[PDB]
């Protein structure tokens, strides 16, 4: 008989949560690139 | 199909999908700001 757990449901949810996490990481990288460029422009 | 939905689960899934969309929009803007500045650095 089928198991109590729906593994496919678990994976679908985990995939969506990981998509949010990876976009947040990419957002942070972009923000840091902008910070870095502005810091470089401000010298002198 | 038949219209049976768990309201709280559906709302959480939609909120996560909207977060993905918002992060994608935000990251497009940051990337395009960086591209714009590089293009300006090419003004000869």
What is d(CA B35, CA A4) in angstroms, rounded to the nearest whole number?
Answer: 51
DSSP at A1: -
A25 touches chain B (CB under 8 A): no
Q: Tokens 């929009």 belong to which residue?
A: B25
Query: From the candidates A13, A18, A28, A30, which should be mutated to test the interface with B, based on the most B CB atoms within 10 A?
Result: A30
Residue of A nearest to B19 (CA): A20
What is d(CA B28, CA B24) in angstroms, rounded to the nearest whole number?
Answer: 6
- From the list B41, B23, B12, B36, the residue with the least C-alpha distance to A12 is B12
**A30 touches B30 (CB < 8 A):** yes
Exposed, middle or buried, A21 (CB in 10 Å: 0-12/13-18/19+)?
A: exposed
**How many of the other CB atoms lie within 10 Å of CB of B18?**
10
Method by which the model was determined: X-ray
What is d(CA B12, CA A40) in angstroms, rounded to the nearest whole number?
Answer: 42
What is d(CA A33, CA B31) in angstroms, rounded to the nearest whole number?
Answer: 9
Give the length of chain A: 44
Please tell me which of the candidates A16, A23, A37 has its beta carbon nearest to residue B27.
A23
Give the length of chain B: 44
């Amino acid at each position: 008989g089928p198991g109590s757990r729906d593994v496919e449901m678990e994976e679908m949810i985990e995939q969506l949560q990981e998509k949010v996490h990876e976009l947040e990481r990419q957002n942070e990288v972009l923000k840091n690139r902008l910070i870095s460029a502005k810091q470089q422009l401000q010298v002198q």
